[PDB]
């Protein structure tokens, strides 16, 4: 069952916003959006699309753990945290595209295929370049579909080990305290309109799991800590978090 609760528009248009956050509660298998519509229209999954990636990369071999160090390659690059070494959970942390950009050339079309489709994820479409499909290739998402997805991933039912699943999880930590964790991805999505933030993850709390998917429009990068912060504020209002 869904529920459509358009008083959470108000958080985005507070902040001269549009977008679609989605709650699924795991305990009661009910969702929450402010849009139905916009909940299952399917966009550029950008940066979102490192947690597939990395579990593919995984499981494949092409990385081995979270320690393993993809070394710079000493290009200068526009964002001063890219041009350093990174681990998986650093290149997570800091969506260092290029990193993933290898991930995926030595994953290969044909493997990327149908690890995407053993998932169910979105479309399913990688066509475009192998190196860059994900922000300006046919693949695409809807918040719902990254939920169903992100489901999976919690339960460890992904067609891929339960270590990938465990490490992947790992390297999504983003937030841990006394009330909750977040377990979560950002993604920036620039290169076809409509440009948008993504936020996608879910919320540990002692005895629930709640699942959230967002995006929302992001005319310039200056509305990207919209992202958490209109999550967070719908997570406040439903008491979810304090
Ligand atoms: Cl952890």
Redesign the pocket.
Known sequence: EWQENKSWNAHFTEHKSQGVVVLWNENKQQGFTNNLKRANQAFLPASTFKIPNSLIALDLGVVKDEHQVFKWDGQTRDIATWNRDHNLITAMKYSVVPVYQEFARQIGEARMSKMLHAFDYGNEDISGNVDSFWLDGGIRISATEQISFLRKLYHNKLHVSERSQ?IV??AM?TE?NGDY?I?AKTGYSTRIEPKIGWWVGWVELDDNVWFFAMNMDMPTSDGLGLRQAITKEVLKQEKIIP
Do not use: D, P, Y
């Open positions: 465990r999880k790992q930590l841990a964790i377990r």
